[PDB]
Amino acid sequence: LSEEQKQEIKEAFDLFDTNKTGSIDYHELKVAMRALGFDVKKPEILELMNEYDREGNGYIGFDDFLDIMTEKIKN
Amino acid sequence: LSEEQKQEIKEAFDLFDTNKTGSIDYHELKVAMRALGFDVKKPEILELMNEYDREGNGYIGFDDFLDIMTEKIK
Amino acid sequence: LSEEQKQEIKEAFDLFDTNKTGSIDYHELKVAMRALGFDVKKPEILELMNEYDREGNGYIGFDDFLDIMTEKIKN
Numbered sequence: 001l002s003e004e005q006k007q008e009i010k011e012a013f014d015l016f017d018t019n020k021t022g023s024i025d026y027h028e029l030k031v032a033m034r035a036l037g038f039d040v041k042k043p044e045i046l047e048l049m050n051e052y053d054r055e056g057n058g059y060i061g062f063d064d065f066l067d068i069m070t071e072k073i074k075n
Numbered sequence: 076l077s078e079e080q081k082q083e084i085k086e087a088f089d090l091f092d093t094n095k096t097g098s099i100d101y102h103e104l105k106v107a108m109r110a111l112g113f114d115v116k117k118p119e120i121l122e123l124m125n126e127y128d129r130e131g132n133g134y135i136g137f138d139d140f141l142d143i144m145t146e147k148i149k
Numbered sequence: 150l151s152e153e154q155k156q157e158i159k160e161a162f163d164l165f166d167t168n169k170t171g172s173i174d175y176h177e178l179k180v181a182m183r184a185l186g187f188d189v190k191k192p193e194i195l196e197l198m199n200e201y202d203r204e205g206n207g208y209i210g211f212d213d214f215l216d217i218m219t220e221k222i223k224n
């Protein structure tokens with residue numbers, strides 16, 4: 001929630017944001033969460049994708065990723 | 076451990092310091108060590124808590140976490 | 150790979166640079182890659198070591214590690 005914590009979450013997102021877009025696809029969400037210490041598996045990742053991929057293009061934004069990590073850490 | 080290494084250990088601790096208490100409980104220690112690349116399981120984590128939770132309240136400080144990562148890395 | 154992505158890869162290498170050399174051994178490569186979200190196993194790590202430990206002393210450099218992570222993140 002703090003600025004220091006938000007930057008660290010941003011570092012994990014920017015590491016696997018290949019095409020310099022503001023998005024990550026399924027595989028990049030898995031390694032990003034694992035880079036933050038969460039051993040997420042395929043059923044959990046697909047559940048998160050379908051919850052946040054509103055336009056249905058296979059990508060989620062950073063603010064989507066920020067809210068995911070917010071739910072995981074604060075709980 | 077150098078200043079650069081200690082800062083990185085500090086970043087992993089501050090990420091899972093949920094209430095800014097300067098302390099982490101069992102679950103927060105587990106994900107923090109895994110955030111540093113160590114796949115730790117429940118028996119090892121409980122053994123670390125029992126070693127460093129001297130007050131017996133279910134929390135350890137950063138200097139407890141710093142010493143844990145010191146022996147795991149060095 | 151942007152300059153900020155290379156800094157994050159450098160942080161993972163420097164965390165397990167135990168003796169302040171420019172090298173990591175088998176075990177230090179395993180945890181360094183796992184610190185970046187890749188849960189690699191023994192056969193893959195030994196495969197990467199054999200490819201990049203050209204001198205054959207059980208160590209690889211940062212530029213070896215940077216190239217490994219470049220291939221992993223860019224599929």
Ligand SMILES: [Ca+2]
Nearest residue numbers: 018019023024
């Ligand atoms: Ca992308």
Ligand SMILES: [Ca+2]
Nearest residue numbers: 035036110184
């Ligand atoms: Ca990590």
Ligand SMILES: [Ca+2]
Nearest residue numbers: 092093094098
């Ligand atoms: Ca706490």
Ligand SMILES: [Ca+2]
Nearest residue numbers: 128129130134
């Ligand atoms: Ca205590």
Ligand SMILES: [Ca+2]
Nearest residue numbers: 167168172173
């Ligand atoms: Ca070394």
Ligand SMILES: [Cl-]
Nearest residue numbers: 038039040041
């Ligand atoms: Cl999980």
Ligand SMILES: [Cl-]
Nearest residue numbers: 125126127142
């Ligand atoms: Cl002790």
